[PDB]
Amino acid sequence: MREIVHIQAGQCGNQIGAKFWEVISDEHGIDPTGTYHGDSDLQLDRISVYYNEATGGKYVPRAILVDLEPGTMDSVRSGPFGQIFRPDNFVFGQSGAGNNWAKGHYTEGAELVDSVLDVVRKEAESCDCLQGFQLTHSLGGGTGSGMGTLLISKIREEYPDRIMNTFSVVPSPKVSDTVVEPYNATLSVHQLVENTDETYCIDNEALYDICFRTLKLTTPTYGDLNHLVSATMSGVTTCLRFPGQLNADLRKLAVNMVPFPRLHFFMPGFAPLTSRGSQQYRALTVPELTQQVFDAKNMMAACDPRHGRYLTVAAVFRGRMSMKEVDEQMLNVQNKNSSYFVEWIPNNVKTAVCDIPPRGLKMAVTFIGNSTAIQELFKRISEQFTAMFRRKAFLHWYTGEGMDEMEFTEAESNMNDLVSEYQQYQ
Amino acid sequence: AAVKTLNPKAEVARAQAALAVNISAARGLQDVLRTNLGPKGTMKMLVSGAGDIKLTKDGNVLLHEMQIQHPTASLIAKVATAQDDITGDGTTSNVLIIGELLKQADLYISEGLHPRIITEGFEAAKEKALQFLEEVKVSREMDRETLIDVARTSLRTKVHAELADVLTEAVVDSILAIKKQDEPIDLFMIEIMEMKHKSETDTSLIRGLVLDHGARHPDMKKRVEDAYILTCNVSLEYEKTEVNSGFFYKSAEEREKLVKAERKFIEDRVKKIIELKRKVCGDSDKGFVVINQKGIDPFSLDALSKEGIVALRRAKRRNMERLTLACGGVALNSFDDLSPDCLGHAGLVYEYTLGEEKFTFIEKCNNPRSVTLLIKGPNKHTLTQIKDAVRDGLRAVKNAIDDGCVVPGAGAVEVAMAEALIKHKPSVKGRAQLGVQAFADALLIIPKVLAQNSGFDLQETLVKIQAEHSESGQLVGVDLNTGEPMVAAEVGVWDNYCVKKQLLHSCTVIATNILLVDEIMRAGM
Amino acid sequence: TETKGTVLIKTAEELMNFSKGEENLMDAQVKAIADTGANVVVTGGKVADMALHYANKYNIMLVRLNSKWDLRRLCKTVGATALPRLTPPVLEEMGHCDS
Amino acid sequence: HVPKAPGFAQMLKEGAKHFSGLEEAVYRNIQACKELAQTTRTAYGPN
Amino acid sequence: HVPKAPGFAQMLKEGAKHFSGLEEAVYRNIQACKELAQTTRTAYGPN
Amino acid sequence: HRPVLVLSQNTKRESGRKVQSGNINAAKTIADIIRTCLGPKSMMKMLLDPMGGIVMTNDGNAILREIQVQHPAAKSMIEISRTQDEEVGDGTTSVIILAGEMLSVAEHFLEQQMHPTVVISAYRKALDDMISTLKKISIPVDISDSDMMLNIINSSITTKAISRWSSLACNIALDAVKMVQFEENGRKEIDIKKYARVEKIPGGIIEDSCVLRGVMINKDVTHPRMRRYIKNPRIVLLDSSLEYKKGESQTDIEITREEDFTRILQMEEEYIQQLCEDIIQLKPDVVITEKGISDLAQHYLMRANITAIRRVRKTDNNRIARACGARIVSRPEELREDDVGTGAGLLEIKKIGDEYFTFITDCKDPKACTILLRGASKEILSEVERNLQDAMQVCRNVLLDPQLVPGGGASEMAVAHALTEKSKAMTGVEQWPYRAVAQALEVIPRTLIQNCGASTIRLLTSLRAKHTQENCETWGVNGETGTLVDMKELGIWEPLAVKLQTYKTAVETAVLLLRIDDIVSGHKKK
Amino acid sequence: VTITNDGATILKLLEVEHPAAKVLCELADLQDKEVGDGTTSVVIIAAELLK
Amino acid sequence: SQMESMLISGYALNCVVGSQGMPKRIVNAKIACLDFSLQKTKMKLGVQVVITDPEKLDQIRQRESDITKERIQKILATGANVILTTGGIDDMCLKYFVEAG
Amino acid sequence: MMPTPVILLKEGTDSSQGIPQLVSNISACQVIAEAVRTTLGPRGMDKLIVDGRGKATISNDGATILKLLDVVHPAAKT
Amino acid sequence: RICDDELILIKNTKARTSASIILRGANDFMCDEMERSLHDALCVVKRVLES
Ligand SMILES: Nc1ncnc2c1ncn2[C@@H]1O[C@H](COP(=O)(O)OP(=O)(O)O)[C@@H](O)[C@H]1O
Ligand SMILES: Nc1ncnc2c1ncn2[C@@H]1O[C@H](COP(=O)(O)OP(=O)(O)O)[C@@H](O)[C@H]1O
Ligand SMILES: Nc1ncnc2c1ncn2[C@@H]1O[C@H](COP(=O)(O)OP(=O)(O)O)[C@@H](O)[C@H]1O
Ligand SMILES: [Mg+2]
């Protein structure tokens, strides 16, 4: 049981979602045209969670690809293993969003989202017990903010009680693509703290310095960008896709990640980060990988964990190792660096492990946890939102589609309330 | 130019330059879309970037799925979007009027005149064209034989006249048994399902509903006669509390007591269903079908299968609206007031599997007021031909029921309207004398395109049609078989009143605004 | 259970008897199908080590079917019904093959 | 020196192609389906 | 997405520009000759 | 590689005549863009957006907002038209032409070795004399008359594209302002942006467009058993949710007994039924909230014959609170009889183009209305929406200041003769820049004859001779024909707040751009 | 775009590199706190004192 | 223009009222200056809600708004008409100012 | 940002104007006067100028030093 | 009404009778110049009344 339907909505969601199934099909040994190539119940038991078994042995991924562009999703049509999905899981959009939040909701969203909900209904027929949904999108995209915010609200009319695990690609504080990026980031999050429970923060432009300095890449691109993001996506859904002693599904992850439901912005990441030549000349031990996730060199967002304080720490390891050394190593950091941890939690760092090795790396750990690192990033978004709205610059692009001046006022009051929500325990 | 000085990367078009951009682009959309107007039009195969075939010739699907990047083509595509949104047909004829309102006006603006003088003649010609349209409409009290000829005209122009005899019986008989006593007919009560069973000429009209999901348990009955429909909105699957609670137990004997107790609230919903089957005199067959919009766990599916209750799951939003009218029950959201008054009735509930995909059929209702057109096209692209023609035909008969009058057919409206503007051409008494002439010649493209697609002559046909109209009083039209002028009101070729009314209003305003554009430019970078 | 799952111990009597209480709970369920005359027990999911201890003790054969479409074809083969609950006293939904 | 032929009435495609007529559309669909008929003609029958 | 304005009636040049009217041709010839008048205005006279 | 010893790296320096005479040419360039969009014989200007949309308009504010310029003085003129758009409605295109002409005559005096502070001190003395001239030629307006207010709004939309449907658009814009004119305490206010929502629906004809006596939203009913046609409903507006959500705490429940897990699932159903019993004590008919409604709340409102709408926007809840007179409450157990929207008229869930629309119309005395626009496409409906915003704001200025100025060139020529006769007593070096302000006002009657194709020599010589006498003083330029007709017979009248804001902004634009003698560009900031 | 003529607002937004240039730029910032209008005249005197 | 620069004898606050149901003009007003967020009563990090009885669940959930509205009724019964807050007033607490005027 | 015409001024030429031009010419003559400043008087030193070919020429005459500096400034050539 | 925004005013405050100045200009570039020129003018009368 506990089936999860995946919804890859947006331009940036399909680029991550193309390599998201490349890791699952390689670790489980699922043949794209055969039946399976597994070995035991570590890989063959959890096939029915993320795949629906057809008659004959062919496995179909529970994935819905939504995009308001024909040319973007054609790479996932007949490209890098994109012919394995259902033909009705390829909902195209002939009208582009144009990096506008108001166009994807009132113009494009009024005619497409009734058909996108039909694809979730057909996927839920093969789900004997629906656990929840995931949503990979972006804040600086038109379809990621248009078909990601309106899709997450209409899915609660049919699924009001099920959990949600959204994946949000945050914009970068270093470079900018357009001036409406503080507009699209403020409007998408303002309806995201309303009735959701999980949201990560991944910065793509911040990973260009990680590939240049650590992964030893001279000229990075979008193909080298999404490789280590897929390692972070597979690290969260490790115990969900592989059985083990530390059983923790998405239902157990929704409770033990947030003491409060509103402050649900996490900082994903993983470890280690080795290049293509210096990987074999490095040994990986238990205190080596456990002490690398706390530093600033293993962050997926442009943040600084050296000036913050965490609330809940969860880590999933890869490989048969002694997990009693993880708790004893992290407890010694909580006594000497108690200003970075919680004072009333005796076991801040949670433990998770599996018996399936990853691709390429021998041992690997991932970092899932919230802190005050999102608080300093939410101030820069509201700072750019304040200067643009006070001059009322480019408001006719939004108010001409169905918005108003009071819509941005309520979107500014509650987003600055989230800044004071993180400012209490800082 | 002034825009080149401020922004060096900003293109511009001047007064005599921007007029040639909009007119030559309107001729580009006119010369493409004129090959599909009427029954003698040709099919267009539209291939996207993926490689799928979209074989259709409707004017709205042609303009949207066309690789064109032009600002003039985006204005006509938005007017063509609203023509296929509120009234169905009238999209191909929409673009051909705009293609002639800018081409006939170019003969005067380039010959010294101002574009505003032509737009003043379009408003004076629209006032006479609106008054003449109310004099040619025929009220026939919405007879069921009249609606056949209305649906036959809209269906022939999208199929090869072998399926038009089949789809007319599936469109007219579907639109009559929805609403009565002067009620607006809701088109959401008709379900359109795509099948692959027999052939394209096998689309039938199911009197009930066809659900695209089947039973999710192998022990359930596949064919159920004399069933009771119990429409539910509750969630029979396992749900947790909103507050994160979890369990705490001491021994292993108390572990199995918590699994039995956590399903007690789930089984209390199932016990309300199996006790309703015992209160409807279950000493017979007495089939029970639960559609159940929200999901059901396999624990409750195993409990309902032992009693003999077919239980579906994951229904649509409008399935609780169409089946509620068809079965006559009450779509409940709780099991606190279960009664036989909220139950439905169907004479036959059966399923059928088409390539590991079940389809639940519900038939034999008394007064359903909700039907389903079962399209069984062989290919994937042939399903898009019938679905785009059914909604073109359903919106045609919906306008003929709401409006009390019927408008005549092919050339019985456009030729008679153009002759009425010639006798009222000296009535303007000013410089706008040539504006009524440009509007009257633009309305004559509908007999010109229909005479061109049928293979006949263009100018020789329009002489004989205008001769029979000037020497008689009957609204004569175009015959696409012989070329002789034939009356459209007698041969059974009709049209909608709201289509011809909006063709005189949406095309005229979008032509007077395009002719008053002289500064096409691209700035903002 | 399905929500969280957590064992709560408050005294030494609940810790020492928890391991022996789990083995006696699994022993009564495997011997419940051995009294009904079963010989072959085919499951869909995984099987613990304590379930294999009493399957070889009461001499019943275990068959692991990881595919769920192959499990439905086995019910049409021997004429049985797939039970979603754990091992009951099976009244009449047993399978019957020859070898 | 050498001139060229530009677009005429509706060349608004951004890299797409267009086919119209009996020779450019109808006869080319026949010759493409003729090659699939000659492909599986050898694998037809008991021999 | 973003459309653009193409040539209209006589855009047949291979990299050459064109000026027509009073604002594009006559007013720009005046402002260009005005800059030469303001250039040599300082060097005019005995001072 | 040794660095170069420089100062203020990667920045520009420019001073002298290239900045004083450089900002004039940037102001003349923008004034030549919208010069063909002032008279009634104007033409539309099709624009292209970076989002992919198309803005086909002739309004001077909507054109300049779609232009991205790189010149610094050109960025100042765009913010001038944004100021005129927020203060008045039809005060846009006239300021950009006038500020370009006041800087056109200012470039002449900068070549005569005159200091720019002398021209600005003459501009401020000329600005104080243009305000006193318009107040002498004004006329009091009877705001209680309906036919008098229709002639004011018709004069503002004759330039725009809704001049063809002038008999319909004048009645819509007049009834929209008179409905939203709300006064609770001792302060009169007119809010035509938060309460007078202009919604456009593609389809139908423009002649069927009308202002509804109430509000409308694009929302369907939550359940098909709920009524879609109520005669006189009692609408109760909510703000909180009708669901069960997690509290703002770290609540966790330890479940040790068997009856504990089934009790929490029953207490979640009894909590929803408690707040559903608190809203039916006032016997309502329509429940409207902003957050989600669970299916347990839909069941109790179904058998109580209550039509519930789910996810109405917050700006739409503030608009329906003024129409029905309801109170937006956020607590179901604190409902009162004053929070019920009595007096609401017919409620009907219509369908316009395969989409349901909730209509709340036919109210007794609504304080907020919704203009229903129906046209050919979304392209021309954005034009009528931008023209009705310029038609409702010019009615707001008359209701706050009932004075009219004779427009159509008669306003500019009545002050240009007043500045000429007052310049005879100057006797100084500021006399000649004082005369250029009266000559700069001539560009507004220059534009009305250049758009219709009339002569600018034979007409302006006769128009200047008509204002030599003090008796008539109201002769303007008729843009329809092209002759000189008195504005007392045509009916072209502009409000006082439009003409005062036009002259105050065009002078101070020339004040700012004449004190600029240096430009530094190339530095960064935080 | 920032249109100003005060001696403090110009030199604060203007980027400088020379160490002798940062003395005169920080001299204008001190005139706002101590006096508040005296912040074009100090920069011309302090540069002519060095000339 | 620059000749319409108002000299407001008093103070000119650069903020909005928020909810559009409050009287925007109050004569003879009594200003209540306070700095604490008028939101729902959220417990701190050291305090958690661990309930052992399902009957005591709904009384704790209603207590987060009853303690919140207890402060808003004792600052409003003293004649205060204008309340200035540097923190945050959520949508539940805005009802008590519209109801009391 | 100011001059953006369709036809430019001459080709690409830059020209200073007024009072900043004259101080630019006076300060340019001060730099070229330092190459003859230390060569005056009986206690004045000589200077050594090396060209691109490597030929060394040590002198103290003003007609010898200034001809080997290769000055391209217009006012400093006077 | 402050030209399409909301501004709250308090009249004479009944205790100290303070003052606030609302500036009115053509564009945002003049309003930033009018704010800097008014703040330098407030510092002149401050030093005269003190010293
Ligand atoms: N059987 C017929 N005989 C003559 N004319 C017909 C017939 N059927 C349709 N037409 C004409 O074809 C024209 C276009 O029909 P259709 O293609 O359905 O609408 P549109 O062109 O707007 O998409 C109509 O104006 C009608 O007069
Ligand atoms: N019938 C008419 N006769 C003469 N002049 C007219 C007529 N209608 C409008 N005008 C003039 O056209 C001008 C249009 O100004 P407009 O661009 O609407 O200003 P804004 O941009 O502030 O709205 C008005 O100043 C008015 O004097
Ligand atoms: N009416 C006037 N007559 C003569 N000189 C004046 C007049 N008004 C101002 N000034 C001079 O202009 C100068 C302006 O200096 P300013 O730039 O304000 O200094 P700071 O930058 O320190 O504020 C003053 O030194 C003053 O002497
Ligand atoms: Mg106007």
PDB file of N, CA and C in Angstrom, chain F residues 128-140 403-406 414-415 418 422 470 472-474 496 500:
ATOM      1  N   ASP F 128       1.774  79.950 -11.885  1.00  0.00           N
ATOM      2  CA  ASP F 128       0.836  80.559 -10.947  1.00  0.00           C
ATOM      3  C   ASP F 128      -0.223  81.403 -11.644  1.00  0.00           C
ATOM      4  N   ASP F 129       0.020  81.818 -12.887  1.00  0.00           N
ATOM      5  CA  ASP F 129      -0.960  82.587 -13.640  1.00  0.00           C
ATOM      6  C   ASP F 129      -1.849  81.720 -14.521  1.00  0.00           C
ATOM      7  N   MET F 130      -1.475  80.460 -14.753  1.00  0.00           N
ATOM      8  CA  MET F 130      -2.343  79.556 -15.500  1.00  0.00           C
ATOM      9  C   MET F 130      -3.430  78.955 -14.620  1.00  0.00           C
ATOM     10  N   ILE F 131      -3.185  78.854 -13.311  1.00  0.00           N
ATOM     11  CA  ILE F 131      -4.202  78.330 -12.404  1.00  0.00           C
ATOM     12  C   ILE F 131      -5.310  79.356 -12.203  1.00  0.00           C
ATOM     13  N   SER F 132      -4.945  80.637 -12.116  1.00  0.00           N
ATOM     14  CA  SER F 132      -5.932  81.689 -11.904  1.00  0.00           C
ATOM     15  C   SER F 132      -6.772  81.962 -13.145  1.00  0.00           C
ATOM     16  N   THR F 133      -6.289  81.586 -14.329  1.00  0.00           N
ATOM     17  CA  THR F 133      -7.056  81.814 -15.549  1.00  0.00           C
ATOM     18  C   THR F 133      -8.148  80.763 -15.725  1.00  0.00           C
ATOM     19  N   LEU F 134      -7.863  79.511 -15.358  1.00  0.00           N
ATOM     20  CA  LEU F 134      -8.855  78.449 -15.499  1.00  0.00           C
ATOM     21  C   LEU F 134      -9.988  78.591 -14.492  1.00  0.00           C
ATOM     22  N   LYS F 135      -9.712  79.175 -13.326  1.00  0.00           N
ATOM     23  CA  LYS F 135     -10.752  79.380 -12.328  1.00  0.00           C
ATOM     24  C   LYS F 135     -11.682  80.533 -12.680  1.00  0.00           C
ATOM     25  N   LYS F 136     -11.266  81.427 -13.577  1.00  0.00           N
ATOM     26  CA  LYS F 136     -12.130  82.507 -14.032  1.00  0.00           C
ATOM     27  C   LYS F 136     -13.029  82.094 -15.188  1.00  0.00           C
ATOM     28  N   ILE F 137     -12.590  81.144 -16.013  1.00  0.00           N
ATOM     29  CA  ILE F 137     -13.365  80.692 -17.161  1.00  0.00           C
ATOM     30  C   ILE F 137     -14.134  79.410 -16.859  1.00  0.00           C
ATOM     31  N   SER F 138     -14.190  79.000 -15.596  1.00  0.00           N
ATOM     32  CA  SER F 138     -14.892  77.783 -15.223  1.00  0.00           C
ATOM     33  C   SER F 138     -16.398  78.030 -15.153  1.00  0.00           C
ATOM     34  N   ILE F 139     -17.141  76.953 -14.920  1.00  0.00           N
ATOM     35  CA  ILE F 139     -18.600  77.010 -14.862  1.00  0.00           C
ATOM     36  C   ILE F 139     -19.087  75.991 -13.836  1.00  0.00           C
ATOM     37  N   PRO F 140     -19.974  76.375 -12.915  1.00  0.00           N
ATOM     38  CA  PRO F 140     -20.484  75.409 -11.933  1.00  0.00           C
ATOM     39  C   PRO F 140     -21.408  74.389 -12.582  1.00  0.00           C
ATOM     40  N   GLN F 403     -16.605  71.689 -11.472  1.00  0.00           N
ATOM     41  CA  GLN F 403     -16.238  72.804 -12.333  1.00  0.00           C
ATOM     42  C   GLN F 403     -15.740  72.262 -13.665  1.00  0.00           C
ATOM     43  N   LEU F 404     -16.142  72.915 -14.753  1.00  0.00           N
ATOM     44  CA  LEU F 404     -15.803  72.482 -16.101  1.00  0.00           C
ATOM     45  C   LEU F 404     -14.986  73.549 -16.814  1.00  0.00           C
ATOM     46  N   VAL F 405     -14.026  73.099 -17.614  1.00  0.00           N
ATOM     47  CA  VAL F 405     -13.179  73.970 -18.426  1.00  0.00           C
ATOM     48  C   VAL F 405     -13.497  73.671 -19.887  1.00  0.00           C
ATOM     49  N   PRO F 406     -13.662  74.689 -20.753  1.00  0.00           N
ATOM     50  CA  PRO F 406     -13.948  74.407 -22.169  1.00  0.00           C
ATOM     51  C   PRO F 406     -12.755  73.812 -22.898  1.00  0.00           C
ATOM     52  N   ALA F 414      -7.441  80.375 -24.123  1.00  0.00           N
ATOM     53  CA  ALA F 414      -7.936  81.365 -23.174  1.00  0.00           C
ATOM     54  C   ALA F 414      -6.856  81.781 -22.185  1.00  0.00           C
ATOM     55  N   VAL F 415      -5.888  80.907 -21.926  1.00  0.00           N
ATOM     56  CA  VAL F 415      -4.789  81.248 -21.031  1.00  0.00           C
ATOM     57  C   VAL F 415      -3.611  81.850 -21.797  1.00  0.00           C
ATOM     58  N   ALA F 418      -4.146  85.336 -21.944  1.00  0.00           N
ATOM     59  CA  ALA F 418      -4.003  85.925 -20.618  1.00  0.00           C
ATOM     60  C   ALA F 418      -2.542  86.067 -20.217  1.00  0.00           C
ATOM     61  N   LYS F 422      -0.590  89.808 -19.761  1.00  0.00           N
ATOM     62  CA  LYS F 422       0.077  90.015 -18.483  1.00  0.00           C
ATOM     63  C   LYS F 422       1.583  90.179 -18.635  1.00  0.00           C
ATOM     64  N   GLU F 470     -12.710  89.836 -25.235  1.00  0.00           N
ATOM     65  CA  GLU F 470     -12.953  89.243 -23.926  1.00  0.00           C
ATOM     66  C   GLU F 470     -14.355  88.667 -23.781  1.00  0.00           C
ATOM     67  N   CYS F 472     -16.222  86.362 -25.982  1.00  0.00           N
ATOM     68  CA  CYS F 472     -16.512  84.978 -26.360  1.00  0.00           C
ATOM     69  C   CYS F 472     -15.667  83.988 -25.563  1.00  0.00           C
ATOM     70  N   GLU F 473     -14.343  84.020 -25.770  1.00  0.00           N
ATOM     71  CA  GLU F 473     -13.291  83.371 -24.976  1.00  0.00           C
ATOM     72  C   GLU F 473     -13.373  81.842 -24.868  1.00  0.00           C
ATOM     73  N   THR F 474     -14.348  81.206 -25.531  1.00  0.00           N
ATOM     74  CA  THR F 474     -14.559  79.768 -25.403  1.00  0.00           C
ATOM     75  C   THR F 474     -14.539  79.055 -26.751  1.00  0.00           C
ATOM     76  N   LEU F 496     -12.246  70.507 -14.188  1.00  0.00           N
ATOM     77  CA  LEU F 496     -11.206  71.408 -13.705  1.00  0.00           C
ATOM     78  C   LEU F 496      -9.995  70.634 -13.200  1.00  0.00           C
ATOM     79  N   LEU F 500      -6.166  71.302 -14.475  1.00  0.00           N
ATOM     80  CA  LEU F 500      -5.211  71.787 -13.483  1.00  0.00           C
ATOM     81  C   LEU F 500      -4.049  70.815 -13.320  1.00  0.00           C
TER      82      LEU F 500
END
